[PDB]
């Protein structure tokens, strides 16, 4: 028989194909909306600074909410407290990197381990490149390279993150589920900095590489990835 | 049925079209293009008729066999590879053969062949080289050119013509083709003063001159 079963097979196939097409359109429109939002955010600071200058006052921009941290010292001879903080920040290997959202706890935690890390405020392009090139997902306690959107969609579907654009937007804007997104994100393994470092041991202010560099972390990332 | 129209968008960049999805939906006029829903042969025998089965089963299977291969897409046979040519090489340019039996002989270049090899010849009347093929990598292209846009070379010569056979005897067809090409090439190079002697000479490196310094 199966005169109906055979057509039902392809009916199910067509339904699945239409569902996939709808999902693709959804993520495409969401990416377009994210691009619009990024442009709006970029122009808003310029507008506010311009109006403040025109009025003669000053416009202090909001303190950055997202930071990128790279471990720049080895495993040998580490104080136990610094070792514990590095373990908590998930920097167990030299030239590992991760994103950290900022608050009092994060500030003090980073201050404890200033000599061992170089951290700064990542740029949108830096986030994009880091996610696309070095970004691997932690699925089933396994380091899986993110080569398809379904891998992201399963691990973060309940948080309405369904593709690379959602992941990047949520990381860059520090969304409500930034903790879940960042934890799903495996720590980045960056190559050695092409062109060399200035001086690993000392602080960035005194001509070294350790400590906080506000926006030079983007210059560092460009050569470390 | 239906004559195959050309693509409606010029290639902006490789893999990216000039017009978007909606512009294409308009240009294709798809708003009015909606659509909706062997192995046996009978033969006579002198008995009766026999249903002979072509594609019969093999009479020997090997002890063991290798499995199939996984499928790959970007790999194409050498026949349909895209052919590249250096910018400095144009018809009528002087080349310096670097690796053949004709080491360092200045030779006039005529045409790019189908498999990528250069069809080259300096009239063997003066520098002693016939119609020949040469890989574009193994030649130095100097910046001296003659005008051969107004010469005709036979269409019958090709890679199948120049393919090696099997003592090698030159054929009368080879001789007549060489004469036909050189009878037009030679007057062109004789117009330029001191060019025949230049082609007769042989390139060489003496002490104190270095290729990265000297220009050609």
């Amino acid at each position: 028989n199966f005169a109906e079963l055979k057509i039902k097979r392809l009916r199910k196939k067509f339904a699945q194909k239409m569902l996939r097409k709808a999902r693709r359109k959804l993520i495409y429109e969401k990416a377009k909306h994210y691009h619009k939002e990024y442009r709006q955010m970029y122009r808003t600071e310029i507008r506010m600074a311009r109006m403040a200058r025109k009025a003669g006052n000053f416009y202090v921009p909001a303190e950055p909410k997202l930071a990128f941290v790279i471990r720049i010292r080895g495993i040998n001879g580490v104080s136990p407290k610094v070792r514990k903080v590095l373990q908590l920040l998930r920097l167990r290997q030299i030239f590992n990197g991760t994103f950290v959202k900022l608050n009092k706890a994060s500030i003090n935690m980073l201050r404890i381990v200033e000599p061992y890390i170089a951290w700064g405020y990542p740029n949108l392009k830096s986030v994009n490149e880091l996610i696309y090139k070095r970004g691997y997902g932690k699925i089933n306690k396994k380091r899986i390279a993110l080569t398809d959107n379904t891998l992201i969609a399963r691990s973060l579907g309940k948080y309405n993150i369904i593709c690379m654009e959602d992941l990047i937007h949520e990381i860059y804007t520090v969304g409500k589920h930034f903790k879940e997104a960042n934890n799903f994100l495996w720590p980045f393994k960056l190559s050695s900095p092409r062109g060399g470092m200035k001086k690993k041991t000392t602080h960035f202010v005194e001509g070294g590489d350790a400590g906080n560099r506000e926006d030079q972390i983007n210059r560092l990332i460009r050569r470390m990835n | 049925k239906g004559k195959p129209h050309c693509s409606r968008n010029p290639v902006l960049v490789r893999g990216i079209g000039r017009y978007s999805r909606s512009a294409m939906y308009s240009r294709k006029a798809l708003y009015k293009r909606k659509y909706a829903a062997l192995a046996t042969v009978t033969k006579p025998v002198g008995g009766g008729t026999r249903v002979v089965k072509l594609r019969k089963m093999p009479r020997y299977y090997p002890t063991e066999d290798v499995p199939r291969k996984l499928l790959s897409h970007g790999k194409k046979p050498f026949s349909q590879h895209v052919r590249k040519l250096r910018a400095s090489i144009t018809p009528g340019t002087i080349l310096i053969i670097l690796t053949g039996r004709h080491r360092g002989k200045r030779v006039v270049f005529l045409k790019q062949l189908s498999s990528g090899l250069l069809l080259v010849t300096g009239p063997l009347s003066l520098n002693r080289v016939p119609l020949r093929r040469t890989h574009q990598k193994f030649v130095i292209a100097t910046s001296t050119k003659i005008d051969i846009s107004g010469v005709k070379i036979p269409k019958h010569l090709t890679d199948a013509y120049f393919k090696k056979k099997k003592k090698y005897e030159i054929t009368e067809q080879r001789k007549v083709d060489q004469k036909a090409v050189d009878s037009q090439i030679l007057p062109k190079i004789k117009a330029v003063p001191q060019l025949q002697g230049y082609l007769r000479s042989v390139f060489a490196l003496t002490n104190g001159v270095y290729p990265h310094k000297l220009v050609f």
Partner: peptide
């Protein structure tokens, strides 16, 4: 529409409309 459950009828609608 992209929701597998509530978007089934809308998906059917657009699929039939394409015809």
């Amino acid at each position: 529409i992209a929701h597998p459950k509530l978007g089934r009828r809308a998906r059917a609608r657009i699929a039939r409309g394409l015809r």
